Design an enzyme around this catalytic site. Structure first.
Site, PDB file in Angstrom:
ATOM      1  N   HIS A 292       0.500   3.111  -2.064  1.00  0.00           N
ATOM      2  CA  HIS A 292       0.253   1.682  -2.143  1.00  0.00           C
ATOM      3  C   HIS A 292       0.606   1.074  -3.488  1.00  0.00           C
ATOM      4  CE1 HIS A 292      -1.590   1.159   1.756  1.00  0.00           C
ATOM      5  NE2 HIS A 292      -2.483   2.100   1.519  1.00  0.00           N
TER       6      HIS A 292
HETATM    7 ZN   LIG Z   1      -4.875   4.377   3.903  1.00  0.00          ZN
END
Ligand SMILES: [Zn+2]
Ligand SMILES: [K+]
Ligand SMILES: [K+]
EC number: 3.5.1.98
Lengths: 288, 130, 96, 138, 101, 393, 165, 37
Positions: free
Chosen positions: F150
């Site tokens: 992320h």
């Molecule tokens: Zn995740």
């Protein structure tokens, strides 16, 4: 020659330069060692560094021109549902370790933007129970104990090797012992956080200092405290193991029942005559 | 809270809690040759053809204890052999002495430096002693 | 409504009984006495006679009002982990 | 003075020359290959066989036979690659000088390259940092 | 657990040693071919010519003869480069506007 | 273009065997985000324990990889970001209040002691796995400390601070034309997709949950810009999806990608917030359902690089990672856990099982048919031109 | 007279009909593909040679497991009996590469086999270093090509935005 | 009911810490510490 002034230290300076030219020193350690003679003058130093071909591997923060910007992505050109075009000036952010295919393959102008979407389903929102929320706290406390204890158990290993070696050495080697940051192993962060956990978050600094300067006086003394708290903490942990093991065996199985737990009231509410009629779909009542 | 321990703790945090600028990393003296990567030391000793053994790194020096005395490294570095390495301080002192006694006078130290810097990228050039 | 629920249970019966009948115990857990036997201090485990007949018999005991609801639910959970919640009210549907 | 756009004109010439140079050398490499297509397969086969095995002596003999049969064609490849590399480095220096003089001139305006000032966005940034510095003054 | 980590210690040692040797072999044979090329490059008597953008020279092309402009003043290898230029990948010479008009 | 089927017993095929290189570093478990944070590196350590005590270490080779250097981090991140990471500590945060505001630091991604070292371990393991895969040594390369998918090129996002998968794929691309990336987390793999969006050499394929969720991106109509158009596959799904559903969606997408894109190096994120009982995810996957993905991606036969990811209930990530690692070695394990130093955490019956719940599946044969048809349509502009001789990938 | 002349402005990269045929060519991108596709085959070769040489250098390029390091077993006082109520520091003793020990079951035949084993090592070393130099050259080449392609694309973009297109 | 929570892991007392700090300072050769027992 004019700046360094004295001829003795200038001689040593020239000898270090010759140490470079004789293919023994390296470029970075050369500039590092020159620091002690050409530090207080910046222009000499930068002319030198350009001369020798000296490039820093990454840039500092105090001298960077194209910063990061907290930019409001509302006023930017869209492509598809999520992506937005960056301004041009935020695409010249320095990435000092990129080669040519690190510019061929990577993407530099489009950013993502999160869209808060409302779902198509007409249903109740799945959530967490209270039984699923007792487990998360049980595991949070299990982890806190394991973290502190197994972090103590590695500083123990290091200080143990160091004490085993100190017990097999003379007195001049005891006054002539010093340890680098990292104490001789891979990590450089864990033993310091252990030491200020066990001792003090503020006075562990002096212990780490005397641990780097005087490993022969300071670290058979520290190792006998880590071993004390190891046993204290493991005592407490295997005490609370049974408490947690008791609190787990009920809510574990009552914690994977998402439907049932309210299916009681749900089947009470969806067996009425109203709904039993409404399922026939040719009769009409009115839509709620 | 006694007007001594206060500034004591104050100095402690003021000396150990900073913004880790690379401009403050403690740098060693140029004359202390023990802070020299132990490959600089070996290359110096090998270039000026000094007469020393190699050094014990740091893992081989903490490997010396009654328990550590049964490893292959101890029994290959402490019996009767010629490759018997030593403590870095000894080799560093030999290197330091050959540094402060063998001496140089310019007129050939500088032009060699310039020829070296201007040819860094070159593989085929004048090796100033090899 | 009642018939369909009983039908799904009597479709799961075979796999459920020959799964509870071949249950193993993990030896170190037995020797360190980590498991529990509450649903065996009460007979609420589904030992090697069929599981359908047992859930029927326990439904009857629940109707007569000697077996608390909590323990009927827990027995159904552990024998039918996520597959027999649609019987938790087998007494309040019949009553209606 | 005027702007005769010399950067972009030399850039056009360069970019047109780049793909003509390469293909002669690529065909030379393809020609070198055509000898090594009944030697490399069985060599790889015998090497993986000897690696994952009275007869092994004959096998090693065959492998050395094929090795020094196939040795000559492996110097052709790197000779060709070296001349190809020198040619393309000449072309690359040409290109880079043309590019830098285009940018140093204004054959690409410096408001069209490094973007606009104050860019209707970026008010969020000024708000955030203004608050940080303000309560830093507070 | 101690038996397993004993095995791990010996496997990691074997890995690092074989990497050492393959890497030293590759480095020496790299230096050899670089020596070869830099040797033959000293054998050229007449280099190649190529096109480029005419620059202002010392006693040469046209702007320094007629008194019009200065010279190009090449810069040093390693110097303050602007970051935008460092993104357009780079190789920057000629401090300020080399071209001869 | 989707018919639902039952979920078949996971089973290792004997015609192919691998040379697994497993990467572990006994330091990693020793870092902690803070008091109540859902991210706990300790679980990696826990998985190691089972690997040791099951006897599974005896068919693979376990290595510590050297930490990644600052200038290997700046191949994808900026200098200001990495310099911030290197200089910030829980003690001097007050002197970085601008940068913390500017790099997305402070609540969802705090600064702990050992942040830079933890990042070094993750990145090092990923890049060394990639390099060892390039040198023809190993076939599979496992690194459970990496998979922080992320993270942004200039920003900390969603428990992640450094994108080690980007560095790994950059190293894999030096010798390979075309690299596939599969992401079976419950969140969208948005850092990797944002990084390789305008190229055709990395194909990203996410199977995520799209809704009022995190991060908020990854629709069915987000398929790449520029020359990277049709080189970004998203499969948005709804709550409750279980093993049979997931397997019938997951297999044909991956098989069509393999037939068309013909990649010849797969990276596989094996996040564990997509398991039943997780504390942030909302799927209803078993352990066999979550491991059949690994088994299928392995049944093809091209260099795989398996990495970690999410998983916020430690027990379940530990068990499924150990089971997957046993499956990569052609070994179906046994269900009774051996005694190990974590013979807690595994209540109430101490087995190698992850149990699903009875919560309801909000995904039905028409939504999935529509999604998979749109995808199969988007996924035919991504082949290789007819005159381009390959190396049998 | 229109074909044959210079750029007069930035918009001429898309407006001009000859100059546009260059800045929009899909040709610098197919060359890079062919280059990487040959780099891949040559790396396959480099890998298959780099293990022959290691079988003949002594190293074991096979994977070494727990049962190949014939480490000497030790014994401390663990593993208690039921219900009652150094060889540690030694070195693996790695046996031999199976490829090398499979050769062995006269003196002339032994010197024959010795010369064969010498030739193998030297030939494999030469071939390996040559393929490695080939690959290094190919990579420098592809770097130049993709640098040109990137510059081309940046010019195309600045041009098409200058026009407002 | 339930609601049973493990109490926090503890550290050395200021007096045990003061004794170690002055003993390390004495063995080494630094002046006395500012807090004495
Ligand atoms: Zn995740
Ligand atoms: K995903
Ligand atoms: K892509």
């Amino acid at each position: 020659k004019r700046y360094i002034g004295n001829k003795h230290l200038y001689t040593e300076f020239l000898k270090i330069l010759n140490l470079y030219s004789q293919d023994i020193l390296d470029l970075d350690d050369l500039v590092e060692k020159v620091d002690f003679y050409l530090g207080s003058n910046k222009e000499l130093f930068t002319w030198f560094k350009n001369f020798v071909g000296y490039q820093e591997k990454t840039k500092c923060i105090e001298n960077i021109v194209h910063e990061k910007h907290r930019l409001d992505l509302d006023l930017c050109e869209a492509f598809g549902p999520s992506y937005k075009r960056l301004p041009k000036s935020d695409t010249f952010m320095p990435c000092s370790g990129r080669d040519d295919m690190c510019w061929e393959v990577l993407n530099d102008e489009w950013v993502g933007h999160p869209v808060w979407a409302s779902e198509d389903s007409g249903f109740i929102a799945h959530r967490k129970n209270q039984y699923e929320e007792t487990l998360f706290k049980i595991e949070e406390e299990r982890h806190e104990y394991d973290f502190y204890i197994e972090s103590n158990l590695r500083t123990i290993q290091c200080l143990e090797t160091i004490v085993n070696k100190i017990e097999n050495m003379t007195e001049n080697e005891k006054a002539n012992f010093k340890l680098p940051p990292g104490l001789g192993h891979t990590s450089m962060t864990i033993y310091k956080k252990v030491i200020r956990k066990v001792y003090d978050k503020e006075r562990g600094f002096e212990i780490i200092d005397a641990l780097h300067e005087h490993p022969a006086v300071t670290a058979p003394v520290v190792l006998k405290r880590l071993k004390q708290k190891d046993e204290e903490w493991r005592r407490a942990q295997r005490e609370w193991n049974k408490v947690w093991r008791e609190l787990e065996q009920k809510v574990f199985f009552k914690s994977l029942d998402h439907l049932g737990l309210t299916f009681k009231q749900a089947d009470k509410k969806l067996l009425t005559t109203k709904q039993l009629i409404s399922e026939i779909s040719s009769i009409k009542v009115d839509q709620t | 809270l006694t007007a001594a321990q206060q500034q004591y703790i104050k100095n402690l945090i003021e000396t150990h809690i900073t913004d880790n600028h690379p401009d403050l990393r403690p740098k060693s003296h140029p004359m202390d040759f023990e802070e020299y990567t132990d490959a600089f030391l070996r290359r110096y000793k090998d270039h000026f053809q000094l007469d020393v053994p190699d050094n014990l790194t740091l893992q081989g020096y903490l490997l010396g204890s009654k328990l550590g005395a049964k490893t292959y490294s101890y029994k290959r570095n402490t019996q009767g052999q010629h490759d018997k390495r030593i403590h870095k301080r000894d080799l560093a002192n030999v290197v330091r002495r050959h540094f402060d006694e063998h001496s140089i006078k310019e007129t050939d130290c500088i032009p060699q430096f310039i020829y070296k810097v201007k040819n860094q990228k070159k593989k085929f050039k004048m090796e100033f002693r090899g | 409504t009642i018939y369909e629920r009983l039908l799904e249970i009597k479709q799961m019966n075979e796999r459920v009984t020959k799964e509870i009948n071949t249950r193993s115990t993990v030896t170190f857990a037995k020797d360190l006495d980590l498991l529990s036997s509450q649903l065996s201090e009460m007979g609420l485990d589904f030992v090697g006679e069929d599981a359908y007949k047992q859930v029927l018999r326990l439904s009857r005991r629940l109707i007569n009002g000697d077996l608390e609801h909590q323990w009927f639910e827990e027995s159904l959970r552990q024998a039918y982990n996520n597959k027999a919640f649609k019987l938790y009210t087998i007494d309040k549907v019949t009553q209606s | 003075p005027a702007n005769l756009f010399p950067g972009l004109n030399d850039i056009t010439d360069v970019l047109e020359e780049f793909p003509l140079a390469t293909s002669r050398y690529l065909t030379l490499l393809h020609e070198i290959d055509a000898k090594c297509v009944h030697s490399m397969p069985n060599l790889n086969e015998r090497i993986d066989k000897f690696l994952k095995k009275q007869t092994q002596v004959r096998l090693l003999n065959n492998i050395n036979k094929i090795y020094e049969e196939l040795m000559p064609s492996l110097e052709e490849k790197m000779h060709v690659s070296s001349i190809m590399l020198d040619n393309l480095d000449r072309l690359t220096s040409r290109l880079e000088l043309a590019y830098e003089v285009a940018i140093k001139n204004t054959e690409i305006p410096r408001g069209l390259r490094l973007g606009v000032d104050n860019h209707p966005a970026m008010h969020l940034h000024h708000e955030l940092m203004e608050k940080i510095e303000s309560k830093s003054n507070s | 657990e101690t038996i397993a980590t004993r095995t791990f210690i010996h496997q990691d040692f074997h890995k690092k040693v074989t990497d050492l040797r393959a890497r030293l072999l590759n480095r020496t044979t790299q230096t050899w071919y670089d020596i070869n090329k830099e040797r033959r490059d000293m054998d050229i008597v007449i280099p190649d010519v190529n096109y480029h953008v005419p620059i202002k020279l010392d006693n040469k092309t046209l702007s320094c003869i007629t008194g019009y402009a200065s010279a190009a003043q090449l810069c040093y290898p390693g110097e303050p480069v602007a970051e935008d230029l460092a993104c357009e990948s780079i190789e920057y010479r000629y401090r300020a506007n080399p071209v001869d008009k | 273009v989707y018919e639902a089927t039952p979920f078949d017993p996971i089973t290792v095929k004997p015609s192919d065997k691998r040379r697994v290189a497993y990467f572990y570093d006994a330091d990693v478990g020793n870092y902690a985000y803070g008091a109540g944070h859902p991210m706990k590196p300790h679980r990696i350590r826990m998985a190691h324990s089972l690997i040791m005590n099951y006897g599974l270490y005896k068919k693979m080779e376990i290595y510590r990889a050297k930490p990644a250097t600052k200038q290997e981090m700046c191949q994808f991140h900026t200098d200001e970001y990495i310099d911030f990471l290197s200089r910030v500590t829980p003690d001097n945060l007050e002197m970085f209040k601008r940068e913390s505001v500017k790099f997305n630091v402070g609540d969802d991604c705090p600064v702990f002691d050992g942040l830079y070292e933890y990042c070094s371990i993750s990145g090092g393991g990923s890049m060394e796995g990639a390099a060892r895969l390039n040198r023809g040594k190993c076939d599979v390369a496992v690194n459970y400390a990496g998979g922080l998918h992320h993270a942004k090129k200039s920003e900390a996002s969603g428990f992640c601070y450094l994108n080690d998968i980007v560095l790994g794929i950059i190293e894999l691309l030096r010798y390979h034309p075309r690299v596939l990336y599969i992401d079976i987390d419950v969140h969208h793999g948005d850092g990797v997709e944002e990084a390789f969006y305008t190229t055709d050499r990395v194909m990203t394929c996410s199977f995520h949950k799209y809704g009022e969720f995190f991060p908020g991106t990854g629709e069915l109509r987000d398929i790449g810009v520029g020359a990277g158009k049709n080189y970004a596959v998203n499969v948005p799904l709804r709550d409750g999806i279980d093993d049979a559903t997931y397997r019938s969606v997951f297999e044909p997408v991956i098989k069509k990608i393999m037939e068309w894109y013909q990649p010849s190096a797969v990276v596989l994120q094996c996040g564990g917030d997509s398991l039943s009982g997780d504390r942030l995810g909302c799927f209803n996957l078993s352990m066999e359902g979550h491991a059949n993905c690994v088994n299928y991606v392995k049944s093809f036969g091209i260099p795989m690089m398996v990495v970690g990811g999410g998983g916020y209930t430690m027990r379940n990530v530990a068990r499924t990672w150990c089971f997957e690692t046993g499956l990569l070695n052609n070994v179906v394990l046994d269900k009774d856990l051996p005694y190990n130093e974590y013979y807690e955490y595994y209540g109430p019956d101490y087995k190698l099982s992850v149990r699903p719940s009875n919560m309801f599946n909000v995904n039905t044969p028409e939504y999935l048919d529509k999604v998979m048809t749109n995808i199969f349509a988007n996924l035919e502009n991504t082949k290789y031109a007819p005159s381009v001789q390959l190396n049998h990938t | 007279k229109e074909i044959l002349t210079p750029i007069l402005s930035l918009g001429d990269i898309i407006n001009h009909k000859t100059i546009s045929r260059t800045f929009s060519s899909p040709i610098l991108k197919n060359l890079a593909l062919q280059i990487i596709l040959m780099i891949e085959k040559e790396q396959m070769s480099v890998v298959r040679y780099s293990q022959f040489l290691e079988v003949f250098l002594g190293d074991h390029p096979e994977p070494i497991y727990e049962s190949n390091l014939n480490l000497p077993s030790y014994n401390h006082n663990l593993t208690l009996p039921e219900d009652r109520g150094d060889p540690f520091f030694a070195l693996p003793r790695l046996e031999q590469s199976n490829a090398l020990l499979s050769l062995l079951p006269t003196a002339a035949e032994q010197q024959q086999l010795n010369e064969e084993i010498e030739s193998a090592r030297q030939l494999s070393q030469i071939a390996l270093q040559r393929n490695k130099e080939f690959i290094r050259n190919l990579q420098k080449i592809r770097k130049s090509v993709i640098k040109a392609n990137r510059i081309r694309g940046r010019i195309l973009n600045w041009s098409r935005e200058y026009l407002g297109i | 009911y339930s609601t049973k929570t493990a109490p926090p892991l503890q550290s050395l007392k200021p007096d045990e810490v003061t004794e170690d700090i002055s003993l390390i300072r004495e063995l080494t050769g630094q002046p006395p510490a500012p807090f004495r027992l």
